[PDB]
Amino acid sequence: GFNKILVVAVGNICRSPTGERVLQKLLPNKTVASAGIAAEKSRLIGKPADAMAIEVAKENCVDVENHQSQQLTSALCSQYDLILVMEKGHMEALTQIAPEARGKTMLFGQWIGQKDIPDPYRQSKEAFVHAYQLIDEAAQAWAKKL
């Protein structure tokens, strides 16, 4: 069974913390965390979720406060049963870091047409609203299957 879920993207400040907390609210019987493939190179480790990501989630009663961006590592992947990436291209970048994690890595937006969810970083609130919408729809579908 998939009990520990890791939501993965690039910076671990916008989509992946949002997906973590949206999914955590829908799946209180699971442990959900998140990480970024390039959090360290982006100089983001320890940073909170983007303020606009927090605000958009808060308007939907999802708490993205007290987040700290962390880097995706092979050791981290071993702690989770299921990994959900925001873009299909993230899978190959992830398996470069943790080739053993291929089998448990799936797409966050699998159930909404296997769609990528684009990064809203450094764009207007509209982009964060769009990202939240896709994350919400995608997470609702995952919650019924885990």
Numbering used by the authors: 1 to 146
Question: Can you provide the manuscript's text about this entry?
Answer:
VvWzb belongs to the low-molecular-weight protein tyrosine phosphatase (LMWPTP) family. Interestingly, it contains an extra four-residue insertion in the W-loop, distinct from all known LMWPTPs.
In the presence of benzylphosphonate, a compound that mimics the phenylphosphate moiety of the substrate phosphotyrosine, VvWzb and VvWzbC9A crystallized in space groups P1 and P212121, respectively. However, only phosphate ions were identified in VvWzbC9A structure, judged by the unambiguous electron density. The source of the phosphate ion was not defined, presumably from benzylphosphonate degradation or contamination. VvWzbC9A-phosphate shares a similar active site structure with the VvWzb-benzylphosphonate complex. As a result, the hydrogen bonds between the phosphate ion and the P-loop residues are generally shorter than those observed in VvWzb-benzylphosphonate, suggesting a stronger binding. At the distance of about 3.5 Å to the phosphorous atom, we identified a water molecule that forms a hydrogen bond with Asp119. This water molecule is assumed to be activated by Asp119 and functions as a nucleophile in the dephosphorylation reaction of the phosphoryl-enzyme intermediate.
